[PDB]
Amino acid sequence: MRYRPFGSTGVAVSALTLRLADNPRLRANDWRALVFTALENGVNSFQIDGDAPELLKGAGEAFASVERHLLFLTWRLRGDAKQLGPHTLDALKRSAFEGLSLDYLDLLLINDPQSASLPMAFESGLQDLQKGRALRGLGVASRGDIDPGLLANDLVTAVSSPYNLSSGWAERHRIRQASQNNFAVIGEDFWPQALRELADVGGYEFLTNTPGWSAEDICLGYALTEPSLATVRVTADNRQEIERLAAVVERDLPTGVCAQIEMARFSAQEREKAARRPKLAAALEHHHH
Template identity: 30%
Template sequence: MRYRPFGRSGKVVSAISLLLRESGAVSSPAAWRATAIAGLENGINYFELSASGEALPIGVGAAISTLERRLVLLGWRIQHQGRVPLTGRSLMDNIQGGLARTGAGYFDTLMLDDNAFNCLNRDGHQCLEDLKAAGLCKRIGIVGEGDVVDRCLVAGAFDVLSTSCDVTSDGQVRRRLREAAHQDIIVVARNPIPTDLIRGSQLSLGRKAGSFFGLKPRDTLAGVGTFQFLHTTPDWTPEDICLAYLLTEPTMATVMIEAHKPDIIADWASVADRELPTGVPAQVEMARFAEEDQPRRRA
């Protein structure tokens, strides 16, 4: 694993980080503890939790309890549905519950999805300031890629930007990233794999499946941009190329993936130690140019 500065915090963050979100596949504290330990064993030190129940935060809290707190970055995500105002009381109850269950003492990042940020009332905004002042949440961030994010960038309203980014990201996305970096905002890349391109191989999304069975992807991307190299680069899967390319972006502090199985976490983490093949960055730029000239239809 490789590490980068986490803004001006004095901490470092693993190049690959984990989003842990409640799901039916993992439902017990013990299972979430195993997931977090798998991340730690592979050098991952930043975990963002999206939870309304107890199992996830309790499990992750147990996994990091034996470590020095300064060595781990822990994020807490706030999601909000509809247009009901998000109040300070609601925020405080949510965060205090998360801190109690994780036993973390504080969150390094408090991440609000763009709808939550948009629905904050005056009391909610004041609560965010109070949480930072009290040291309960070191940094406030926003998750999204729309107009709300752009308005917040202009206002300088947050410390961390978590946004979708992949090899196909257009000029607007890259401009947003440059603006964030110029303001010393920590950038977290989400959704690093453009699934419509990956599906073009007609192979299972299981990691390494093609090389394991000796199969070669069918040429189904002919005429669709110039991203065919994702499927033809020797010894690389399309997913690995997409992730490794983002890891070369200087504006990114970390690339966040979502996984809960230890073997998949280990597989993703191993990409951080690989050097991107010579010529791939140029191929990405040429493919982007072709796509912007004649946009690809997405599913």
């Protein structure tokens, strides 16, 4: 395992971040063992994306097995950010601080409100948690452009964004600009469904025809080469998956794979212009006034 600085927090994070999300088949000791396995593969960054009592119990017990400062703990808070408030923060206190037995969270990762501001009572509660050292930073998850007025908020220290080997320059520019402005960036969706379909049929078929590599491992290896990502979020629900993903961190992508990734970006298909409808255009032109 390799380790990167998390933005300007001064905390080193493993190249992979393990997301823990509700799975009703899992009981508490499964969650504890999942985290134990991640720790044994050098993963110190965890993202809690669920709040079932068994998840909190097992995860909290595993986190307690190492000294707190060795871990980076993010709570993922979904829902319409514009509708968050004091009841949200009460729930966060029950789940994150009682459920996981934490004194502080490193990062609260919320949805992009698509606004320059947060609701007042929620932001005031966040400020309270920050001054109490119970919350060390706020992050914004987005699949588009986050309002710079929101990123300028003193609470906001991190962003989360998708990035994969078929991302274009808009997505790449978002992560690189955020990193150059000293935000920590968490990469998401290194292996999205659309790319799994492309890997089977078409220009990306090399992803399933490269000796010694799976398509998923190639997509992870590529995201791991991107300078602007502090860490790449992965989800794994058994030991074998954690071990394989962590193994990718120490491998080198073949240069021929890199060239095929670049080759594959080309796009040719164009459209002939669509039909004229002068009758329709004329009726619209002659609207009543």
